[PDB]
Short mmCIF file of N, CA and C in Angstrom, two decimals:
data_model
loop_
_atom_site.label_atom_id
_atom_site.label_comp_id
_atom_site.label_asym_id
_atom_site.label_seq_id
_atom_site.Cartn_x
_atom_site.Cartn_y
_atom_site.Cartn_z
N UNK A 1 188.61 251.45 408.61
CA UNK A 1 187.37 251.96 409.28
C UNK A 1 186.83 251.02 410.35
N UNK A 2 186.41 250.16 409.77
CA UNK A 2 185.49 249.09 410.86
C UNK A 2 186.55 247.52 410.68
N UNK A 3 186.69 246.86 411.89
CA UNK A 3 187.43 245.67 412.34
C UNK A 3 185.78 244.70 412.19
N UNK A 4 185.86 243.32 411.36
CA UNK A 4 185.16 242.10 411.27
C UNK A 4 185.22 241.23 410.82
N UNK A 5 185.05 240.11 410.07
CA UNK A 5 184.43 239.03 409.41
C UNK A 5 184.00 239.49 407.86
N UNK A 6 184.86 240.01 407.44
CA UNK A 6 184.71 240.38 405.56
C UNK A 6 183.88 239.34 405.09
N UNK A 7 182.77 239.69 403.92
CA UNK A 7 181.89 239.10 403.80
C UNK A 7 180.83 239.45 402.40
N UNK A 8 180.66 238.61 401.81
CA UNK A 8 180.09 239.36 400.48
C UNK A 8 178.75 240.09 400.55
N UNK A 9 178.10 240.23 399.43
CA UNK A 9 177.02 241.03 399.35
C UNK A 9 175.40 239.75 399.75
N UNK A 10 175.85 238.82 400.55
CA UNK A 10 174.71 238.24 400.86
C UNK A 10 174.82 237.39 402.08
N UNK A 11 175.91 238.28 403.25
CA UNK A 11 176.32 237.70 404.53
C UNK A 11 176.68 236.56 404.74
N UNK A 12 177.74 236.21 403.84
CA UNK A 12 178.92 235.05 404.06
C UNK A 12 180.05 235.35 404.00
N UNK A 13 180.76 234.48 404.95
CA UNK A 13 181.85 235.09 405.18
C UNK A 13 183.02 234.30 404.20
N UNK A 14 184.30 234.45 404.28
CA UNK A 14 185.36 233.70 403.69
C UNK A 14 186.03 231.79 404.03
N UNK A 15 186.10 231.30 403.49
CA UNK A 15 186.73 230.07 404.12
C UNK A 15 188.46 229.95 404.01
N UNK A 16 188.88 229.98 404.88
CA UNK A 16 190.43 229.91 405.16
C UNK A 16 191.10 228.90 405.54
N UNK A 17 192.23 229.04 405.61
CA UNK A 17 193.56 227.92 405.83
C UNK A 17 194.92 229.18 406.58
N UNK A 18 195.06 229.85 405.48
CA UNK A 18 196.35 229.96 405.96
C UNK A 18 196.38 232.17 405.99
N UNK A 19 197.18 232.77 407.06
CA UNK A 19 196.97 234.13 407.20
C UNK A 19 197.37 234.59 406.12
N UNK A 20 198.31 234.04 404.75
CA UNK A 20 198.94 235.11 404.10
C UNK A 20 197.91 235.54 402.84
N UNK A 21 196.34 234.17 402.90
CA UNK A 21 195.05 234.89 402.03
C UNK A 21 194.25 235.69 402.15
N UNK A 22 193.90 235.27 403.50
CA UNK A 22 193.40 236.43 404.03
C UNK A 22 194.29 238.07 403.72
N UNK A 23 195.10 237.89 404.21
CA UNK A 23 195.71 239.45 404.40
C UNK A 23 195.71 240.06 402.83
N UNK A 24 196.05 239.10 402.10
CA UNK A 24 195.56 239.98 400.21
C UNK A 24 194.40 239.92 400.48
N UNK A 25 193.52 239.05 400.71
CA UNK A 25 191.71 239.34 400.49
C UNK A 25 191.93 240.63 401.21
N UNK A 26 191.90 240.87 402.47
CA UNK A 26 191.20 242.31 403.12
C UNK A 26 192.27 243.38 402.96
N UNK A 27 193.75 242.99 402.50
CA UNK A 27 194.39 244.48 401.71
C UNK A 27 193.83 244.66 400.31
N UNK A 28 193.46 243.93 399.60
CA UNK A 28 192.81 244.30 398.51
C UNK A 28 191.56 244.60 398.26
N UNK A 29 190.46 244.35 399.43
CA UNK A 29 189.78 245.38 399.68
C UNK A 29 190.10 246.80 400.68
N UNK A 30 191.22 247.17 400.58
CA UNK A 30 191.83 248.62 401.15
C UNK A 30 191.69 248.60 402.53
N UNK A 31 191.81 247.03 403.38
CA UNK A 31 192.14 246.78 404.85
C UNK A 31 193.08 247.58 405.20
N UNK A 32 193.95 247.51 406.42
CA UNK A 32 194.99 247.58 406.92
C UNK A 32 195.87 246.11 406.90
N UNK A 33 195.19 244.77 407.41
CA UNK A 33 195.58 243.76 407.30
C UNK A 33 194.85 242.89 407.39
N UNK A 34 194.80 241.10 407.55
CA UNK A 34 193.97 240.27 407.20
C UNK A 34 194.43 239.17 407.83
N UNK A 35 194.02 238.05 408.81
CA UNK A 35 194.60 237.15 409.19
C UNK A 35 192.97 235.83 409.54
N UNK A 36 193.46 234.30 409.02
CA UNK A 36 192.52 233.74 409.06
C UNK A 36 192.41 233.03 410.73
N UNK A 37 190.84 233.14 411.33
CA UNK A 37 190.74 232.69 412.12
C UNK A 37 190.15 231.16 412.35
N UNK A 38 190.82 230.33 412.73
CA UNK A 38 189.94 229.31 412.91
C UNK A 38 188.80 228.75 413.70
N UNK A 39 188.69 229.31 414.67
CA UNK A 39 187.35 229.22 415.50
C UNK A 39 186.43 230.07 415.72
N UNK A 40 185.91 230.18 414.69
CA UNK A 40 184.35 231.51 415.06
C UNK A 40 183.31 230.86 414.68
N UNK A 41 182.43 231.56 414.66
CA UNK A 41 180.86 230.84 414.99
C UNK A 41 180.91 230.15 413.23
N UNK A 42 181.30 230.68 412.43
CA UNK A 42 180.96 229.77 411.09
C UNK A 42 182.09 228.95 410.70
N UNK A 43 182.91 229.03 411.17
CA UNK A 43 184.23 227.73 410.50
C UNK A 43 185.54 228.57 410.76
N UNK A 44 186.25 228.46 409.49
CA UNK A 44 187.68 229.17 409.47
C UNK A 44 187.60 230.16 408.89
N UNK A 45 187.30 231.49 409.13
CA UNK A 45 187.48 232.98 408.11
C UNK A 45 188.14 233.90 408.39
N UNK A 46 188.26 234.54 407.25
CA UNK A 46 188.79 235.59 407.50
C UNK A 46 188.44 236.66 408.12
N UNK A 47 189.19 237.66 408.57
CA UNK A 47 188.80 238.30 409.66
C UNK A 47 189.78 239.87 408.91
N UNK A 48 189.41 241.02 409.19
CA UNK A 48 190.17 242.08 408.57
C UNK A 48 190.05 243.00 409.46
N UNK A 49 191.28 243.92 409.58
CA UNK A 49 191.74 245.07 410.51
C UNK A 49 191.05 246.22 409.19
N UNK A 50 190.70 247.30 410.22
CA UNK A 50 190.29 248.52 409.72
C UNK A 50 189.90 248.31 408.06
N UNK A 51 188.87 247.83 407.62
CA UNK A 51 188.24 247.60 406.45
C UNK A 51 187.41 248.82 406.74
N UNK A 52 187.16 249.77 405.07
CA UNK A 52 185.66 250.67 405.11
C UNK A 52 184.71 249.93 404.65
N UNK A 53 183.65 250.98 405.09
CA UNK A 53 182.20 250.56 404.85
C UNK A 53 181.46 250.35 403.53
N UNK A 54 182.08 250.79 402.54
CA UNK A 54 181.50 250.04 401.21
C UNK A 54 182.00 249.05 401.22
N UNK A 55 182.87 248.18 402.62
CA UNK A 55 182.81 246.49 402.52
C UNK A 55 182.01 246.03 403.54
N UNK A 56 181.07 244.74 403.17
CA UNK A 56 180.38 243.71 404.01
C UNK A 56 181.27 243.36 405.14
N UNK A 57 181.07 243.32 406.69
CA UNK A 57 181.24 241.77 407.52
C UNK A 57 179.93 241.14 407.69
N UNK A 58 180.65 240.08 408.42
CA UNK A 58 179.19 239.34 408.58
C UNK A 58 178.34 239.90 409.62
N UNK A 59 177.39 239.71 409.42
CA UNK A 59 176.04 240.48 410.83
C UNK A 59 175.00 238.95 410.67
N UNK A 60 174.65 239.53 411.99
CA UNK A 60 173.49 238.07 412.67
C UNK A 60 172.32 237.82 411.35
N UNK A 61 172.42 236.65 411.35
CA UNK A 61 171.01 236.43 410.39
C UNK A 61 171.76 235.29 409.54
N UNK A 62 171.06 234.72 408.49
CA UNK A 62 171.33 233.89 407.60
C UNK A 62 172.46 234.31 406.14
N UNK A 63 172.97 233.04 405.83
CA UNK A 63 174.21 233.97 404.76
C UNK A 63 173.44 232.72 403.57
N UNK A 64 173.03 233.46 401.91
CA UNK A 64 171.99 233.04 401.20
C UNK A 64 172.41 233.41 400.02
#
């Protein structure tokens, strides 16, 4: 459904190293695929192709 920054139920995102965790984290939330990025505004995360909407990404504001 929606391409972002997978992210739990209190707007944080994942901490990563390597693409092959990511891609189980966001296929096992019913992604398409999953690859970790290292330079975005919060550190190294994961990032997921076509995730639905009963999953979090991150959105502007504080992660708590």
């Amino acid at each position: 459904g929606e391409d972002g920054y997978i992210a739990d139920g209190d707007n944080c995102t994942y901490i990563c190293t390597f693409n092959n965790y990511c891609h189980a984290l966001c296929t096992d939330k019913k992604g398409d695929s999953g690859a970790c990025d290292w330079w975005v505004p919060y550190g190294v995360v994961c990032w997921c192709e076509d995730l639905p909407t009963p999953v979090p990404i991150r959105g502007s504001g504080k992660c708590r």
